[PDB]
Write a protein that binds this DNA or RNA. Structure first.
Length: 326
RNA sequence: CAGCUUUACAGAUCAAUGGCGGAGGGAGGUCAACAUCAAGAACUGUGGGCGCCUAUAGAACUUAUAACGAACAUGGUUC
């Protein structure tokens, strides 16, 4: 309609600074298909991989702190907790393990997932984590009693990212069924099922200050306030690659990594793509490989960290692009 | 052999003041329920001074070749 387009044209987005590559830390001998940082501090960030390991990394130096070898198969995801000094990690060996960070050694392997487990999210407020695998089910664990407390049946296929919010919409799943769910853990049921994607929403992330949750199928990055479970915006992601990552920055600077490796940045809520970045790879590696598989920002937000399939981790420092809608 | 404090004693006037006072058990069970027993050598309250000082106090148990055991098993997890 003309009534909306005109309005869109009238409104302007804020000039977010562009992004330039800063650090590249070829250290893993495998994909680096998870990355995470400490809520409390931003000194280190760990990165689980197809190595089977996960390595810890000092941001400032870029130096490899230490390794951790508590899986058999490849690590798919990790989550350092704000409220406790535990690092949860999870691998396609079906193990959702829990590393003490006072001793850097596993403690509570949680057992229950029938098959390769894709993501963890620690609940920001509770002493409870949430994991989901190709199982097609998101189980919540009491961390003390290392048992699945509840489980969330709804989904009809493998479930990827499964973020935890502190409100009522306490889990924000995202499947290959292309539904992204909002659940009520307490009710033992769904509350609202965002079906707006076309394909496997293989990426989703909570906004820090804004109580919303960007989510990405093969192209269209939707983003939504999950209070009602209502759409907020659609991003200009029109011919970008298969969106692997979908991290959001503190300053409303949503990042999206592709299977292409084209690092695409967007103003959040606007839905305005305001940068593209061509990937890079090593002289030995192939041009098809290069692809940002996992990524996240620091708590401040000036450094984006992208794990790419070059067996690398690339950290990114910081005139905006013209609007032009449909 | 003097002095004062307590019991055992008559019969008292019984005020005065104390102390034993709502004055009423003891010994024990291979009997329970609860609490609590590894922490700044580490305890608990009380007010007052304003999470911390200063007086009150209380305190059973376990500990310095460090422990509830002058005793010694088995698991689970990683390496």
């Amino acid at each position: 309609i003309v009534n909306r387009y005109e309005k869109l044209l009238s409104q302007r987005p804020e000039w977010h600074a562009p992004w330039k590559l800063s650090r590249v830390i070829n250290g893993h001998l495998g994909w680096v298909r998870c990355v995470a940082i400490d809520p409390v501090d931003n000194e280190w960030f760990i990165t689980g991989s197809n190595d089977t390991t996960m390595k810890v990394w000092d941001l400032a130096t870029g130096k490899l702190k230490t390794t951790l070898a508590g899986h058999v198969m490849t690590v798919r995801d990790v989550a350092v907790s704000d409220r406790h000094p535990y690092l949860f990690s999870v691998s396609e060996d079906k193990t959702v393990k829990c590393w003490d960070l006072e001793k850097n050694q596993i403690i509570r392997d949680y057992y229950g997932h029938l098959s390769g487990v894709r993501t963890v999210s620690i609940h920001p407020t509770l002493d409870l984590i949430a994991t989901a695998g190709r199982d097609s089910v998101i189980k919540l664990w009491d961390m003390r009693t290392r048992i699945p407390v509840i489980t969330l049946v709804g989904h009809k296929g493998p479930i990827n990212q499964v973020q935890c919010t502190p409100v009522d919409p306490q889990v924000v799943s995202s499947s290959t069924d292309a539904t992204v769910r909002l659940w009520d853990v307490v009710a033992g049921k769904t509350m609202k099922v965002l079906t707006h994607h076309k394909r496997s929403v293989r990426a989703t992330a909570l906004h820090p200050k804004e109580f919303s949750v960007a989510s990405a199928c093969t192209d269209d990055i939707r983003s939504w306030g999950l209070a009602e479970g209502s759409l907020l915006t659609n991003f200009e992601s029109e011919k970008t690659g298969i969106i692997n990552t979908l991290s959001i920055n503190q300053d409303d600077v949503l990042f999206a990594g592709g299977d292409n490796g084209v690092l695409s940045f967007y103003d959040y809520k606007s839905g305005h793509k305001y940068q593209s970045l061509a990937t890079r790879e090593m002289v030995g590696s192939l041009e098809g490989e290069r692809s940002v598989l996992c990524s996240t920002f620091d708590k401040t937000g000036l450094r984006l960290i992208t794990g790419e399939a070059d067996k690398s981790i690339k950290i990114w420092k910081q005139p905006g692009l013209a609007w032009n809608p449909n």
